[PDB]
Ligand binder design. Structure first.
Ligand SMILES: Nc1ncnc2c1ncn2[C@@H]1O[C@H](COP(=O)(O)OP(=O)(O)CP(=O)(O)O)[C@@H](O)[C@H]1O
Ligand code: NA
Lengths: 8, 288
């Protein structure tokens, strides 16, 4: 998954 | 393997979550496992939130919690595919009617959570799942890993205003307030849903796929692009209600109770002018 779309 | 007497573990359905059976009931379940030794135990936290939410329409039922050898275990209602999965299955185009059907239930789910003294802080298409079977017209919300109390449960004292707070949840769908490092509140859950609805309308958001050297330089590009994109440019070519919704969320004060009813009614009035029926016939129900 793209990091812009990942839960952080 | 067994778990909690009456549950049989199957294979993964994502990461961790496994297919299971309730052997006693004869019903498929989802089983979340967390290694006991894990650095940052959170399952047990997620379970206590789900427990406060129980009785809620579109909240998964937690059937059993406990530890089994090397694992903490949460057994829950088995849910269908996420809104992101269904979006990919629909060729990353939802019809206006599907967006409005989803908007009506999603605002309701967020209101329900807020009524139980929590903010979600991770509103995104991946954390809404359709039900299965008789629940197949119901939008569920999941993944309370980043959720927290915004008010005292007894006094309904709101949490204090604070700044310099780090990005919590997902860059693509985060409120402008979240990018600025402001403590999240009810408004931010609703503002994120606004980005989700225009994401479904467009197929992507204009701050997607920004080139950056790092993860940090990238949240900064997404921040800049978001703050420099007027709501009327974002929502151009779509019904004004999507812009009105986001202007309302952006106008809310930190400790303001949203008018959930007004926001639902915006979309219902649009739904009625289009001549659509609330028959739960989503785009994916048409796939042959
Ligand atoms: N009760 C349930 N029924 C069916 N599927 C479920 C479920 N609970 C979670 N899932 C699915 O299992 C996967 C993992 O769920 P979870 O909410 O733990 O994701 P996550 O917190 O690890 C973020 P990421 O998926 O990016 O790693 C997701 O793809 C979700 O769709
Ligand atoms: Na349906």
């Amino acid at each position: 998954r793209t990091p812009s779309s990942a839960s952080t | 393997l067994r778990v909690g007497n009456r549950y049989r573990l199957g294979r993964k359905i994502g990461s961790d979550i496994y297919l299971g059976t309730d052997i006693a009931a004869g019903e498929e379940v989802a089983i979340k496992l967390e290694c006991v030794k894990t650095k940052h135990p959170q399952l047990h936290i997620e379970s206590k939130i789900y427990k406060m939410m129980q009785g809620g329409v579109g909240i998964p039922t937690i059937r059993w919690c406990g530890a089994e050898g090397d694992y903490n275990v949460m057994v829950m209602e088995l849910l269908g595919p996420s809104l992101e999965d269904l979006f990919n299955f629909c060729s990353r185009k939802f019809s206006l009617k599907t967006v409005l059907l989803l908007a009506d239930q999603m605002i309701s789910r967020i209101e329900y959570i807020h009524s139980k003294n929590f903010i979600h802080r991770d509103v995104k298409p991946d954390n809404f799942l359709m039900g299965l079977g008789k629940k197949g017209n119901l939008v569920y919300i999941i993944d309370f890993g980043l959720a927290k109390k915004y008010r005292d449960a007894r006094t309904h004292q709101h949490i204090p205003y604070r700044e310099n707070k780090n990005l919590t949840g997902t860059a693509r769908y985060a409120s402008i307030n979240t990018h600025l490092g402001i403590e999240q509140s009810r408004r931010d859950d609703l503002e994120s849903l606004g980005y989700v609805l225009m994401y479904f309308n467009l197929g992507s958001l204009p701050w997607q796929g920004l080139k950056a050297a790092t993860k940090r330089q990238k949240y900064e590009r997404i921040s800049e692009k978001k703050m420099s994109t007027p709501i009327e440019v974002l929502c151009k070519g779509y019904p004004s209600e999507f812009a009105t919704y986001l202007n309302f969320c952006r106008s809310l004060r930190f400790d303001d109770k949203p008018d959930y009813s007004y926001l639902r009614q915006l979309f219902r009035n649009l739904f009625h002018r289009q001549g659509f029926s609330y028959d739960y016939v989503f785009d994916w129900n048409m796939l042959k």
